[PDB]
Amino acid sequence: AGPLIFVEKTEPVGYNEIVNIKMGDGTVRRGQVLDSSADIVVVQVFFTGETLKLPASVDLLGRILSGSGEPRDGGPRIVPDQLLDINGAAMNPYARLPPKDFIQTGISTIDGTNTLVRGQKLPIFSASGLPHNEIALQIARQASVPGSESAFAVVFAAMGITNEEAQYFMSDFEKTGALERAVVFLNLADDPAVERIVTPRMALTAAEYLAYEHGMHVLVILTDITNYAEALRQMGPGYMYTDLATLYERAGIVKGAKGSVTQIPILSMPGDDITHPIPDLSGYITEGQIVVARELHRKGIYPPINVLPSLSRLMNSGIGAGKTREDHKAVSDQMYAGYAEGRDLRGLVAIVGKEALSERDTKFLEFADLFEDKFVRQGWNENRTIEDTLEIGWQILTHLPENQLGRIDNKYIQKYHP
Amino acid sequence: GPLIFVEKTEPVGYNEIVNIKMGDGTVRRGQVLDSSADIVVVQVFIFTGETLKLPASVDLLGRILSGSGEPRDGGPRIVPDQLLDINGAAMNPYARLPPKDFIQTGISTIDGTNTLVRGQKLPIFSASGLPHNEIALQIARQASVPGSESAFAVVFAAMGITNEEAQYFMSDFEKTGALERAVVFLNLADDPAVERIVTPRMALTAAEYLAYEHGMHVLVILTDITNYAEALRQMGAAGYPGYMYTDLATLYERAGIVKGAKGSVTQIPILSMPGDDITHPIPDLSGYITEGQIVVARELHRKGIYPPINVLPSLSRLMNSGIGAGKTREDHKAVSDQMYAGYAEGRDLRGLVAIVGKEALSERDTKFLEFADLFEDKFVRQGWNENRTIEDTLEIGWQILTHLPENQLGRIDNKYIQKYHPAHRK
Numbered sequence: 001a002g003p004l005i006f007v008e009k010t011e012p013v014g015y016n017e018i019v020n021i022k023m024g025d026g027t028v029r030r031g032q033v034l035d036s037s038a039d040i041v042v043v044q045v046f047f048t049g050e051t052l053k054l055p056a057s058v059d060l061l062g063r064i065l066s067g068s069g070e071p072r073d074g075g076p077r078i079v080p081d082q083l084l085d086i087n088g089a090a091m092n093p094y095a096r097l098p099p100k101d102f103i104q105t106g107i108s109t110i111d112g113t114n115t116l117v118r119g120q121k122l123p124i125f126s127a128s129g130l131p132h133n134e135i136a137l138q139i140a141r142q143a144s145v146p147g148s149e150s151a152f153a154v155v156f157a158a159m160g161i162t163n164e165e166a167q168y169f170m171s172d173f174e175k176t177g178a179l180e181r182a183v184v185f186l187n188l189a190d191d192p193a194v195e196r197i198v199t200p201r202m203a204l205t206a207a208e209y210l211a212y213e214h215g216m217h218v219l220v221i222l223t224d225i226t227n228y229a230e231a232l233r234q235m236g237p238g239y240m241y242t243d244l245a246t247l248y249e250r251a252g253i254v255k256g257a258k259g260s261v262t263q264i265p266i267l268s269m270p271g272d273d274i275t276h277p278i279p280d281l282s283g284y285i286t287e288g289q290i291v292v293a294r295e296l297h298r299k300g301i302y303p304p305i306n307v308l309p310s311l312s313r314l315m316n317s318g319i320g321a322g323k324t325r326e327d328h329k330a331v332s333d334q335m336y337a338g339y340a341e342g343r344d345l346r347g348l349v350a351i352v353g354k355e356a357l358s359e360r361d362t363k364f365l366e367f368a369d370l371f372e373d374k375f376v377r378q379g380w381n382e383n384r385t386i387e388d389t390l391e392i393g394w395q396i397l398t399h400l401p402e403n404q405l406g407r408i409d410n411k412y413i414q415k416y417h418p
Numbered sequence: 419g420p421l422i423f424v425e426k427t428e429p430v431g432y433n434e435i436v437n438i439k440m441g442d443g444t445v446r447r448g449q450v451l452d453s454s455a456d457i458v459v460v461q462v463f464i465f466t467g468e469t470l471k472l473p474a475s476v477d478l479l480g481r482i483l484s485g486s487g488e489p490r491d492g493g494p495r496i497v498p499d500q501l502l503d504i505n506g507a508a509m510n511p512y513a514r515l516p517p518k519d520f521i522q523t524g525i526s527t528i529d530g531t532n533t534l535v536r537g538q539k540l541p542i543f544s545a546s547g548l549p550h551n552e553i554a555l556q557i558a559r560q561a562s563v564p565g566s567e568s569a570f571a572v573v574f575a576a577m578g579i580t581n582e583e584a585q586y587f588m589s590d591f592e593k594t595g596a597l598e599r600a601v602v603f604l605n606l607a608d609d610p611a612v613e614r615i616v617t618p619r620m621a622l623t624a625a626e627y628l629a630y631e632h633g634m635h636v637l638v639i640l641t642d643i644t645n646y647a648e649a650l651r652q653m654g655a656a657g658y659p660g661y662m663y664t665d666l667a668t669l670y671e672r673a674g675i676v677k678g679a680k681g682s683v684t685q686i687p688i689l690s691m692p693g694d695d696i697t698h699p700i701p702d703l704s705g706y707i708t709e710g711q712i713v714v715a716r717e718l719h720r721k722g723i724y725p726p727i728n729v730l731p732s733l734s735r736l737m738n739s740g741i742g743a744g745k746t747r748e749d750h751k752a753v754s755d756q757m758y759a760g761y762a763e764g765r766d767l768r769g770l771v772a773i774v775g776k777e778a779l780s781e782r783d784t785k786f787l788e789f790a791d792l793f794e795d796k797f798v799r800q801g802w803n804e805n806r807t808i809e810d811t812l813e814i815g816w817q818i819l820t821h822l823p824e825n826q827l828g829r830i831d832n833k834y835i836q837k838y839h840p841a842h843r844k
């Protein structure tokens with residue numbers, strides 16, 4: 001009791017009913033139904049049928065499908081090279097290797113201060129009426145892996161999204177050209193609830209197939225886990241948080257260092273919380289988070305990512321010499337601690353006055369303006385290469401006095417400072 | 419415009435212009451936004467007024483008050499050696515020095531894994547109906563600075579609480595004994611909203627007074643800052659304001675080590691996400707989270723574990739500053755890393771078990787799964803009134819790492835293993 005397996009609907013079935021399943025390999029399972037849809041059935045292990053399966057092929061990239069893997073782009077049915085199982089119990093393709101290499105997001109708030117690393121669970125922490133989806137959109141079309149031998153793919157999964165802003169994605173993905181490396185799953189709010197739950201399992205497995213059996217680094221974007229939750233919320237329990245676990249388990253470097261599975265799940269605070277109680281998704285926050293701040297949003301900054309509450313637990317693995325540029329951490333640390341103080345001094349100005357501040361504190365204050373204005377703010381079609389990211393850093397690091405530059409080495413300064 | 423709290427000496431009207439004498443004597447302009455019975459809120463852009471003053475004295479510590487410094491414990495008025503500005507424009511007593519030494523909070527999930535350092539701003543991220551208020555009380559009772567020659571004190575601050583909770587706090591703080599080190603500021607939801615927003619200013623001005631002028635390490639606790647936002651929101655006839663984010667900055671400025679190093683002001687604000695959202699939108703309190711945050715998770719509450727602090731989301735940025743070798747204990751960091759990873763792994767394997775069954779698991783994988791179970795049970799779970807010393811905290815960490823095999827213990831130096839692992843420890 002506890003787990004779930006998603007099975008093909010061969011016959012109409014009831015509730016709490018004894019039935020059989022023909023697994024991906026074989027191991028026959030004793031289970032009971034929980035809920036049903038039109039083609040999919042959920043069964044808790046501990047008539048005769050078989051698991052719902054994903055048509056795994058390199059022909060998945062370039063095509064758009066629904067949560068159950070049904071086509072949406074008007075095109076044909078996906079021709080399956082293999083017939084893999086949804087819940088990632090097929091190969092067990094992950095290694096006992098720590099996430100190491102670097103992935104470029106294009107956004108400097110991430111790439112600079114909270115670097116994303118090949119195989120990481122870096123969620124975006126957000127709320128309603130915030131541009132999180134449009135950040136995820138920007139990642140999908142701008143993401144790449146500078147240097148790596150392996151091809152790069154993106155798996156974009158949407159859950160509980162409305163028609164009007166479903167066409168948003170459909171248009172964006174095609175009119176950018178970044179479809180030819182991206183498998184896109186869409187799940188409508190109007191779509192069956194059981195189809196929502198299976199969506200990320202279809203998304204992750206598609207990436208697992210690609211990363212392992214075609215040795216490529218794959219980045220998965222799950223837009224709003226909260227919406228995944230509200231479908232599970234309504235499903236009718238002692239699986240509440242362990243189900244979440246089965247989703248954040250599927251992250252890291254695959255067997256044979258060539259490929260990778262990386263995640264950016266969006267977690268956002270709901271429209272209503274009392275009538276629809278939202279679980280703490282804190283289980284997903286283990287390798288850091290990317291905080292989106294309403295404060296930066298209200299002063300007209302995109303992307304409104306507050307770097308301070310944000311971090312990447314594995315950044316130090318994917319930065320510096322060879323991976324990026326050796327002065328990466330040197331700049332990051334300085335930019336962080338720099339912006340950190342300038343921001344706190346913004347309180348000190350309100351207390352004592354603009355004309356009562358130290359000249360030291362004023363150049364720190366103004367730095368916080370510059371960081372938000374010139375570094376944090378980038379266009380929606382601005383794909384800042386890691387060099388620029390670091391360079392824009394240096395440009396604003398010139399404003400604060402040199403003898404106040406935190407802990408950097410002279411060699412890092414004298415060479416890379418204008 | 420930024421709001422300044424003014425001593426009511428004269429009747430005032432809305433939008434009227436005033437000239438406030440400062441803590442030193444630099445007269446400044448502004449206009450009236452709102453007022454209480456005896457306090458006036460003024461935004462800086464003929465009448466001259468004085469700033470609100472705190473009845474500052476060593477003679478505090480023991481008495482409970484209102485957010486205006488008005489006695490609640492039936493005792494006398496506070497006899498002030500000096501009445502200094504509450505807006506912080508009295509001293510600026512903070513030094514250009516990074517928070518260093520350690521604070522014994524008594525809780526493992528904080529002390530061990532997310533160590534609290536003197537002068538830090540480490541919030542407790544919570545939600546509706548979580549034990550956050552209980553954690554605060556436990557910290558207040560237990561907190562200490564071992565070894566440190568500076569006298570330790572705790573300043574407690576309540577915003578928009580209820581009478582039930584007011585009796586919960588007052589009663590505890592008295593009988594537990596932690597009052598002869600505590601200045602308690604209590605403000606309940608029926609005390610004018612004007613006094614609610616002044617409450618943290620008072621608490622911080624008391625903290626600033628003790629730390630600087632009396633060589634003190636002071637710990638400030640602001641309970642539920644989402645209620646403070648609620649008072650900011652519903653302010654005057656003149657969705658959240660513009661000065662809202664800027665106003666919080668006047669609070670999270672006031673923390674750190676005092677001039678001359680002989681004292682500090684440490685900050686534990688409570689940030690709890692509310693019930694509704696279309697009514698009461700959630701504020702961007704991310705202005706506070708800069709030096710880490712402590713996360714209390716429902717998952718652990720629902721399983722019946724106090725304190726329900728999840729260490730994986732939790733963090734302290736400046737932990738390294740007050741930990742190990744005559745600070746806590748040399749091994750400390752080598753234990754934290756190994757516990758964190760061992761819990762992170764286990765936590766993951768609670769999923770893999772639901773994918774391929776309990777039996778269909780690896781030998782090593784089963785051990786980390788069981789570790790993740792022991793972590794919550796014996797390292798996370800601690801009594802409401804047990805003050806675990808760092809030595810205890812870490813030795814518990816050793817009694818838990820024994821369950822894991824030695825060849826898997828990697829985030830730790832071997833010179834630490836042969837010295838401290840119960841199977842070796844000669």
Ligand SMILES: Nc1ncnc2c1ncn2[C@@H]1O[C@H](COP(=O)(O)OP(=O)(O)OP(=O)(O)O)[C@@H](O)[C@H]1O
Pocket residue numbers: 337340341344345348404406512514515516517537670671672673674675736
């Ligand atoms: N001279 C300095 N060089 C580099 N970093 C410094 C210096 N002085 C302070 N800092 C940084 O500032 C932080 C001090 O924390 P504290 O909360 O006391 O100040 P703050 O609120 O960041 O800034 P302020 O008090 O000026 O508004 C430390 O994390 C430290 O790294």
Ligand SMILES: NCCc1ccc(S(=O)(=O)F)cc1
Pocket residue numbers: 426428429430431452453454455
């Ligand atoms: N709504 C109460 C606001 C208020 C309260 C008191 C005054 S005063 O006349 O006493 F100065 C003025 C305005």
